[PDB]
Structure 1
Amino acid sequence: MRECISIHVGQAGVQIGNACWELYCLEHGIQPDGQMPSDKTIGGGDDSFNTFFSETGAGKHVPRAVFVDLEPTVIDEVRTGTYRQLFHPEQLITGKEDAANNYARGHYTIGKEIIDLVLDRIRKLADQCTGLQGFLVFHSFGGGTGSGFTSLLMERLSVDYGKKSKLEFSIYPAPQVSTAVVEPYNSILTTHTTLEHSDCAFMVDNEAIYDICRRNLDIERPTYTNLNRLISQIVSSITASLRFDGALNVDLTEFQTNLVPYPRIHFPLATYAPVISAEKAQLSVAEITNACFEPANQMVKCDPRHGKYMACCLLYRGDVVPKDVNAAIATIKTKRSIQFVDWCPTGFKVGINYQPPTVVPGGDLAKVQRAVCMLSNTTAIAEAWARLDHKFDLMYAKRAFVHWYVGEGMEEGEFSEAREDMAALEKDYEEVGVDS
């Protein structure tokens, strides 16, 4: 057994963190007081769930996770929430005042004073690991902490844990729920800095989750609670292989091996189905697999038809057998536009977990008998980079808000250096994806 440490940074990372760990407990039969009746090896063991949970002599299963925020408000709700007994205070790190949606403030000013404390708390979790795989880092693009401190943390993690893998769950900014106008700045700045330190990053566009919650859950005005419970389902689908018995993606390095042929292009598109309202009073393997190629079900709105695939993974949960999947794939292949790059094989890696997806009791999501999350590395996700870089260019041409960043000790040149790196990234997708 090999352990995975989760790191939740800033408001988005923390609130999504709670959604995920709440879901994990429901999936593994772990009570809010840390007890797990089905675990017979008391106070120890090396089961698949032990990748995420350590054990105390009193039979308490605690998350291998650290929560860090430069403001105490959000994590204080974890300290007094329903799952307060789950974590110990050392795991929950809070600062005094936040980064005010300023990358420079989160990275340089405030990051410098708290980075050693964070690393030390992480070191304590790592010292309890017989074989650490690496880290799963949850954060937003648009927040000052989520962007600025994460990038600093990822740099320091590469130094302290060179051999370990690092996976990202990143929240891409959307105006419908955004709380800052400079989020494109923060997004580009943190992507530039974290790029060489991240092995695989799963971007989640709040716009996509927002519209799915409206369209499929009939929620007029989705809240963070709505968004995060949907996000945690996708995250759970991706990490289920690390927490349950299986043979596909049972290790962090396997994500890179299966989804990331070229290091810089490490942003797989996630697509999930089905999303059914709980108030509404069952789709087949063929139907939910077909939905994986509908832009309306993707975590990032883009058009894979006008791009190329480098790799594709299908993660099923529930009543699914290989025969159904192959028949479904055969039908879809002759029905849709699925172009792979020439230097890669046209195929799918499939993983099935017989346990159907677990939903939060009294939530918006209905219990389904089978679901699927498709992870595909497609060049079409570069559309999200293009949108973001354009908004960057609009403001930066006038140097709008730049003084806030320079005021925190950041140099103006970092803006252009970060933007140039993104321009190179867009070019990389162009070369891989387009013919001429």
Structure 2
Amino acid sequence: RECISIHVGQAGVQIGNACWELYCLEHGIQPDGQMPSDKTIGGGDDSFNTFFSETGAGKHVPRAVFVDLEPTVIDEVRTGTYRQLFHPEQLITGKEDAANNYARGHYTIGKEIIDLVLDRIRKLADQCTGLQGFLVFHSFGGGTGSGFTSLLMERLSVDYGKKSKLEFSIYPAPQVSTAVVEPYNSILTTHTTLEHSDCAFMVDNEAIYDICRRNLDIERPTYTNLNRLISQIVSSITASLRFDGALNVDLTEFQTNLVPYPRIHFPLATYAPVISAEKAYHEQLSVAEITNACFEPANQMVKCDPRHGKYMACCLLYRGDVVPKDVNAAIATIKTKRSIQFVDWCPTGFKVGINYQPPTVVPGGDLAKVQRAVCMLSNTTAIAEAWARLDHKFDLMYAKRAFVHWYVGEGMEEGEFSEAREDMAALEKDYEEVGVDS
């Protein structure tokens, strides 16, 4: 049951790079594609084969497509450490980018490159015997990441109607953002993509930035830092697809376990522990401590306050030295001290998965090796706070029609702005209906 990864725009590509580097480290795959521990040469249907195909010469090749409308970012993949991992058809670049303009990525340029992308994706699909769907990595804020991604999602729904689609989306933050129009792009892409995505993991760059500042003691985090952290979270989420396990073994299960209502499909991710490599000796956090840390806003991928929302589903994904008894003990403890309210029509429970292999880190990196870690995926109404933030920024510019002429000049209509914003307003109201009392 294969899984295809699609990385769109700079954020999607660089995070993709980080993730596949990490995947290779975790499965014992070298930069040249060889995998010594793999005794079946030229094929097999092991778990890691969900993400890697095999050549007759024993090369293990990522089931991935990289797409960017300019070439500078993907060129670094082409000439980088893991260049031998990929075939050139997997790496697609145009000559000029979307200029931070959703409409330019979706309409003007998207129309010219979408079929090429679909063809390359189809080539990967043909290899698959039982494809389950796609993992799509992109920023909210970029012209390509927003516009082209939304176009691509529409077309993927058309060409693979059965398949599941999962999103990993970088929500825009003023600290590391690029464009002043990123709220616009975010609302436009969320509106166009909402029907076509089964489960979306938002990562607020603000949260990652502060985690890097606070716990890694990095004064001014770079994209490399952010991406190594993010890749740790992504690996936690996809480990169940790549390894033997019983929890979340196919893309459909993410939808089944985390999303009771289709529009409300943005689970909050929380990760612990994030410990600095520079710290020579560490106090190893116990199951109780990392599980408790999962309910601290300072460890969330999106800053918000789950105490003032309601849960619809909670998932705990441990890696390393963890046994069920310890988890149940810790959960017992945490219930009595924490504000954890579920909606009345959902069971108050946790789905737990434990992978015995402790997390892997990039050598000479900023993250320390720890003996146990946990990523919590919880669908809480609290994440609507992020939408409220974004929509407000949108409302501020749109009231004056600031920058709108750049979008209209690309063939988009002004009406799409208000259509998208109305959809977001509906989304917020949905969150409030599910989560708020009188």
Q: What TM-score results when the alignment is normalised by the length of structure 2?
A: 0.99
Distance (Å, rounded) in 2 between the aligned partners of 1:406 and 1:314: 45
Aligned residue for 1:8, secondary structure, equals strand
Q: Deviations over 1:178-233 (max 9, x none)?
A: 01000000000000000000000000000000000000000000000000000000
Q: Structure 1 residue 372: deviation in Å?
A: 0.2
Q: Deviations over 1:111-156 (max 9, x none)?
A: 0000000000000000000000000000000000000000000000
Q: Structure 1 residue 388: deviation in Å?
A: 0.1
Distance (Å, rounded) in 2 between the aligned partners of 1:260 and 1:123: 28
Q: Deviations over 1:270-293 (max 9, x none)?
A: 000000000002000000000000
Distance (Å, rounded) in 2 between the aligned partners of 1:287 and 1:308: 23
Aligned residue for 1:85, secondary structure, equals helix
Aligned residue for 2:293, secondary structure, equals helix
Distance (Å, rounded) in 1 between the aligned partners of 2:389 and 2:81: 39
Distance (Å, rounded) in 1 between the aligned partners of 2:261 and 2:404: 33
Q: Structure 1 residue 5: deviation in Å?
A: 0.1
Q: Structure 1 residue 362: deviation in Å?
A: 0.3
Aligned residue for 2:92, secondary structure, equals strand
Q: Structure 1 residue 392: deviation in Å?
A: 0.1
Superposition CA RMSD, Å: 0.2
Q: Structure 1 residue 235: deviation in Å?
A: 0.1
Q: Structure 1 residue 352: deviation in Å?
A: 0.1
Aligned residue for 2:169, secondary structure, equals strand
Aligned residue for 2:17, secondary structure, equals helix
Distance (Å, rounded) in 2 between the aligned partners of 1:213 and 1:29: 27
Distance (Å, rounded) in 1 between the aligned partners of 2:45 and 2:437: 49
Aligned residue for 2:290, secondary structure, equals helix
Distance (Å, rounded) in 2 between the aligned partners of 1:431 and 1:297: 27
Distance (Å, rounded) in 1 between the aligned partners of 2:263 and 2:77: 35
Q: Structure 1 residue 422: deviation in Å?
A: 0.1
Q: Deviations over 1:333-381 (max 9, x none)?
A: 0000000000000000000000000000000000000000000000000
Q: Deviations over 1:303-350 (max 9, x none)?
A: 000000000000000000000000000000000000000000000000
**Residue in structure 2 matching 1:327, options 326, 329, 341:** 329
Distance (Å, rounded) in 2 between the aligned partners of 1:40 and 1:258: 34
**Structure 1: which 4+ aligned runs deviate by more than 4 Å?**
none
Tell me the residue number matched to 2:249.
250
Q: Structure 1 residue 23: deviation in Å?
A: 0.0
Q: Deviations over 1:231-264 (max 9, x none)?
A: 0000000000000000000000000000000000
Q: Structure 1 residue 157: deviation in Å?
A: 0.1
Distance (Å, rounded) in 2 between the aligned partners of 1:141 and 1:71: 17
Aligned residue for 2:375, secondary structure, equals strand
Q: What TM-score results when the alignment is normalised by the length of structure 1?
A: 1.00
Equivalent residues in 2 for 1:180-329 (5 A)? 180-281=179-280, 282-329=284-331
Distance (Å, rounded) in 1 between the aligned partners of 2:178 and 2:65: 25
Q: Deviations over 1:413-436 (max 9, x none)?
A: 000000000000000000000011
Q: Structure 1 residue 382: deviation in Å?
A: 0.1
Q: Structure 1 residue 27: deviation in Å?
A: 0.1
Distance (Å, rounded) in 2 between the aligned partners of 1:30 and 1:430: 46
Aligned residue for 2:350, secondary structure, equals strand
Tell me the residue number matched to 2:101.
102
Aligned residue for 2:127, secondary structure, equals coil
Tell me the residue number matched to 1:434.
436
Q: Structure 1 residue 391: deviation in Å?
A: 0.1
Aligned residue for 1:347, secondary structure, equals strand
Aligned residues between the structures: 435
Distance (Å, rounded) in 2 between the aligned partners of 1:15 and 1:179: 15
Tell me the residue number matched to 1:134.
133
Aligned residue for 1:344, secondary structure, equals coil
Task: Among all aligned residue pairs of Structure 1 and Structure 2, give the percentage whose two residues are the same amino acid.
Answer: 100
Q: Deviations over 1:52-111 (max 9, x none)?
A: 000000000000000000000000000000000000000000001000000000000000
Aligned residue for 1:280, secondary structure, equals coil
Q: Structure 1 residue 266: deviation in Å?
A: 0.1
Aligned residue for 1:350, secondary structure, equals strand
Aligned residue for 1:334, secondary structure, equals helix
**Residue in structure 1 matching 2:419, options 417, 420, 423:** 417
Distance (Å, rounded) in 2 between the aligned partners of 1:433 and 1:293: 18
Distance (Å, rounded) in 2 between the aligned partners of 1:361 and 1:95: 33
